[PDB]
Design a protein around this nucleic acid. Structure first.
Ligand SMILES: [K+]
Ligand SMILES: [K+]
Ligand SMILES: [K+]
Ligand SMILES: [Mg+2]
Ligand SMILES: [Mg+2]
Ligand SMILES: [Mg+2]
Ligand SMILES: [Mg+2]
Ligand SMILES: [Mg+2]
Ligand SMILES: [Mg+2]
Ligand SMILES: [Mg+2]
Ligand SMILES: [Mg+2]
Ligand SMILES: [Mg+2]
Ligand SMILES: [Mg+2]
Ligand SMILES: [Mg+2]
Ligand SMILES: [Mg+2]
Ligand SMILES: [Mg+2]
Ligand SMILES: [Mg+2]
Ligand SMILES: [Mg+2]
Ligand SMILES: [Mg+2]
Ligand SMILES: [Mg+2]
Ligand SMILES: [Mg+2]
Ligand SMILES: [Mg+2]
Ligand SMILES: [Mg+2]
Ligand SMILES: [Mg+2]
Ligand SMILES: [Mg+2]
Ligand SMILES: [Mg+2]
Ligand SMILES: [Mg+2]
Ligand SMILES: [Mg+2]
Ligand SMILES: [Mg+2]
Ligand SMILES: [Mg+2]
Ligand SMILES: [Mg+2]
Ligand SMILES: [Mg+2]
Ligand SMILES: [Mg+2]
Ligand SMILES: [Mg+2]
Ligand SMILES: [Mg+2]
Ligand SMILES: [Mg+2]
Ligand SMILES: [Mg+2]
Ligand SMILES: [Mg+2]
Ligand SMILES: [Mg+2]
Ligand SMILES: [Mg+2]
Ligand SMILES: [Mg+2]
Ligand SMILES: [Mg+2]
Ligand SMILES: [Mg+2]
Ligand SMILES: [Mg+2]
Ligand SMILES: [Mg+2]
Ligand SMILES: [Mg+2]
Ligand SMILES: [Mg+2]
Ligand SMILES: [Mg+2]
Ligand SMILES: [Mg+2]
Ligand SMILES: [Mg+2]
Ligand SMILES: [Mg+2]
Ligand SMILES: [Mg+2]
Ligand SMILES: [Mg+2]
Ligand SMILES: [Mg+2]
Ligand SMILES: [Mg+2]
Ligand SMILES: [Mg+2]
Ligand SMILES: [Mg+2]
Ligand SMILES: [Mg+2]
Ligand SMILES: [Mg+2]
Ligand SMILES: [Mg+2]
Ligand SMILES: [Zn+2]
Lengths: 44, 89, 44, 120
RNA sequence: UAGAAAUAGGUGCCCGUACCGCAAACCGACACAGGUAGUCAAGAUGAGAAUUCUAAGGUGAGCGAGCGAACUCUCGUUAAGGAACUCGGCAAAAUGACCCCGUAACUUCGGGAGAAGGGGUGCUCUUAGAGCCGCAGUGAAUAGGCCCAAGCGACUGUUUAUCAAAAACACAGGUCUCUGCUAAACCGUAAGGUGAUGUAUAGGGGCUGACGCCUGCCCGGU
RNA sequence: UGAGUAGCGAAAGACGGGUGAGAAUCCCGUCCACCGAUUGACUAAGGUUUCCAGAGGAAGGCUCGUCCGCUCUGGGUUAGUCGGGUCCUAAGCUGAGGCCGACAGGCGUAGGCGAUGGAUAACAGGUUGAUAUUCCUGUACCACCUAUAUCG
RNA sequence: CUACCCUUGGUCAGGUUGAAGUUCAGGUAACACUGAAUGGAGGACCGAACCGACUUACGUUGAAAAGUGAGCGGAUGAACU
RNA sequence: ACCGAUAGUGAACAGUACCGUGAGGGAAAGGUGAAAAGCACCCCGGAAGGGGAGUGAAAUAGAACCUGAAACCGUGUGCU
């Protein structure tokens, strides 16, 4: 129910290895800057 | 003492709307009754008073930085004139 | 559920007010203690 | 079919509201899942309107809301009348596919995927 | 009893008055599923302020979007069986409204009793019949499960606010005892009080605990 | 640290339009839905400015926020008749003298204070952003004063 | 807050049962006594409000330092406020 | 041959704020610069906040303002 020992800096960052976001899937707008793929401009 | 009874006229949108109906609003001394206010108005402005309505205002919570406090308590009299008129301006 | 403090202006003044404190020697002792300590509020 | 995070009665009512709003405004912005669900409702309604008979009109009245539409100049009509009038005539020669969905991207408040669904 | 008009005009003070108020403003440390006295009381249904849907009027609840895994919680259904479960039928299921029949032992003759157990109910028409429809007619919601037997306590009531509601307390009834009134008993140093503006068919204290039938022997010891 | 983890406090929302640097969350509209012996309306206690308008968005709001019971500035409560005092008493409190007590004090007579009760003259309509049986209009009533002709 | 008490106020949808009395018709020497009607008693019955807190489920760094849901006891009284 | 901001008064700026029905309990919080000379003006931004330009001996003295340790949180990488 509770941590028996505190988590070291090393273990914490090891666990955060995969905690990240990825670059959006984006494409240049041929006529109308960049946009999400399969989305309309909605602002151009 | 009539000039001690009346402190100052009250000039607001509501008091101007009352002035349109010959009603004049004053801040008065907090220890006076409406008969004293009527007599003071009659003595100072040489008018006839139809009636006086009076009300008390509690101190208002107020601050300036860490210094919180209260405004002074007020007594407000609305004086309805029978005849005459009062030129405050 | 009903709690212990049910405020009542009259009750509060009659039990803890200035005149009730002045009414007994021990109440006057309370007032003297509070004046000695320098309290802003001596009673209700 | 999708549940849309609602009970059956709530989901049915929301789908009726969305379908009527689409019929009235012809173009609405909603979430992706709601639009994917309502495309079927709206297109089956348009099918009934193309059928045109009295029984089809009453079956359509089971689904449509009772809303009024002020037209060009102070002339009113119901959403059912528009569905069996202008909308049905617009799609006489089109065999299905009366709507399209255009994705807009996430919105600020909850990251939900905003889309436009419009009549074709 | 001693004792010693109308009309017209005018005058009439102080305090409260905002706003919340069955709550986001009060009491709960919170914009807290709790607590907070009174008043007003629509329609359909109904005995009703029950039930369900509505009126007046108010409100959509200060995180959302998806998905529709395990598991947890709340809810619905279930073949055949029907308490085999379990400490225990715990929980659930069943009963349930109205109208009409019918109803045991026992009993303090009140009761038990809504005992139990049965029947009916929709819609249309004619003046109780004749019809019509469904699986189903108090077609939803709400509305006693019942019976046999034993222990305890007579009974309504009271109790460990917050693990015990009971066989515990109380009780009406019984008995013993004290008390002749400045009563005894009780509070208080006293004054002064309660008892009681009562007076032995009254008041205090102990024990027992409706009612029925009863309540034996021992006074050496305390 | 646990960890971007638990939670974000009973519920029905959808769309259009607007505003804005920014909108699921603010405003407006339509539809839908919930309470309705009450989630409606009005009194009391309690709170004490939270009320209204304009401006704002650091902090507070369990998210957001252009919004707010939050911040800034300016305003708002009107009574002869409503409730209370200038009337009455209950419980209780107090108490001239008085009785009692090491002190301090306790008790108590006349008397007084004290509503939760008794008495007691105003109603309908209109009006504001914010007050209304209080302001305005209409029509009244009560107490006292004066002027023109038994009280106890 | 809570316990008891004092003074002064307030509240209890509906349904059921049917005590004593009274009247009439008998019955009697008189009185008992019988039947119907009426009557409306009760710490009476069923059941909302209201007051409780028996069981169970949930909750147990709670929505809540004692609650919520579903049933449950009382509900003209030693009632509740 | 007393303290020097956890010390010294509880209190250097308070019997206040806050807590409690009440008696009562009771904090935290000192330092720009010599002098306000407290950053004209330009740029991004709704603002907040910044980068310049100025003031100053110093602005990593810019008001959360002397010095600014450690825990803790980041960015780069020599070896692994
Ligand atoms: K007012
Ligand atoms: K003996
Ligand atoms: K003896
Ligand atoms: Mg006034
Ligand atoms: Mg789905
Ligand atoms: Mg449904
Ligand atoms: Mg008001
Ligand atoms: Mg509020
Ligand atoms: Mg909320
Ligand atoms: Mg609340
Ligand atoms: Mg509450
Ligand atoms: Mg009724
Ligand atoms: Mg109801
Ligand atoms: Mg089965
Ligand atoms: Mg079967
Ligand atoms: Mg069977
Ligand atoms: Mg078995
Ligand atoms: Mg077994
Ligand atoms: Mg059970
Ligand atoms: Mg029924
Ligand atoms: Mg039938
Ligand atoms: Mg018993
Ligand atoms: Mg009982
Ligand atoms: Mg207990
Ligand atoms: Mg135990
Ligand atoms: Mg218990
Ligand atoms: Mg006596
Ligand atoms: Mg006994
Ligand atoms: Mg016994
Ligand atoms: Mg014996
Ligand atoms: Mg002897
Ligand atoms: Mg952590
Ligand atoms: Mg995650
Ligand atoms: Mg974990
Ligand atoms: Mg997880
Ligand atoms: Mg979660
Ligand atoms: Mg919430
Ligand atoms: Mg409803
Ligand atoms: Mg406001
Ligand atoms: Mg925020
Ligand atoms: Mg404000
Ligand atoms: Mg005395
Ligand atoms: Mg003496
Ligand atoms: Mg009163
Ligand atoms: Mg108002
Ligand atoms: Mg009532
Ligand atoms: Mg009873
Ligand atoms: Mg209550
Ligand atoms: Mg109890
Ligand atoms: Mg319950
Ligand atoms: Mg019972
Ligand atoms: Mg009952
Ligand atoms: Mg230092
Ligand atoms: Mg110090
Ligand atoms: Mg600078
Ligand atoms: Mg700069
Ligand atoms: Mg610069
Ligand atoms: Mg600088
Ligand atoms: Mg430096
Ligand atoms: Mg420094
Ligand atoms: Zn583009």
């Amino acid at each position: 129910a509770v941590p028996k020992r505190r988590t070291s800096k090393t273990r914490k960052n090891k666990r955060r290895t995969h905690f990240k976001i990825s670059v959006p899937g984006m494409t240049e707008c041929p006529n109308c800057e960049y946009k999400l793929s399969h989305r309309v401009c909605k602002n151009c | 003492e009539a000039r001690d009874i009346l402190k100052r006229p009250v000039i607001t949108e509501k008091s101007s709307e009352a002035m349109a109906e010959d009603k004049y609003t004053f801040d008065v001394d907090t220890r006076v009754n409406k008969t004293q206010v009527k007599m003071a108005v009659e003595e100072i402005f040489n008018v006839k008073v139809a009636s006086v309505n009076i009300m008390n205002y509690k101190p208002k919570k107020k601050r300036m930085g860490r210094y919180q406090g209260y405004t002074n308590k007020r007594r407000k009299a609305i004086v309805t004139l029978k005849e005459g008129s009062i030129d405050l301006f | 559920v009903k709690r212990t403090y049910q405020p009542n202006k009259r009750k509060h003044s009659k039990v803890h007010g200035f005149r009730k404190r002045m009414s007994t020697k021990n109440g006057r002792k309370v007032l003297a203690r509070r004046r000695r300590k320098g309290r802003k509020v001596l009673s209700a | 079919y999708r549940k849309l995070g609602r009970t059956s009665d709530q989901r049915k009512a929301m789908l009726r509201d969305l379908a009527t709003s689409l019929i009235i405004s012809e173009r609405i912005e909603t979430t992706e899942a709601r639009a994917k669900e309502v495309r079927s409702v709206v297109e089956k309604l348009i099918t009934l309107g193309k059928k045109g008979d009295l029984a089809s009109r009453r079956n359509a009245a089971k689904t449509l809301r009772n809303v009024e539409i002020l037209n060009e100049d102070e002339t009113t009509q119901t959403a059912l009348q528009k569905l069996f009038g202008e909308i049905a005539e617009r799609y006489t020669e089109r065999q299905g596919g009366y709507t399209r969905i255009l994705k807009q991207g996430p919105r600020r408040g909850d990251g939900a995927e905003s889309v436009i669904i419009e009549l074709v």
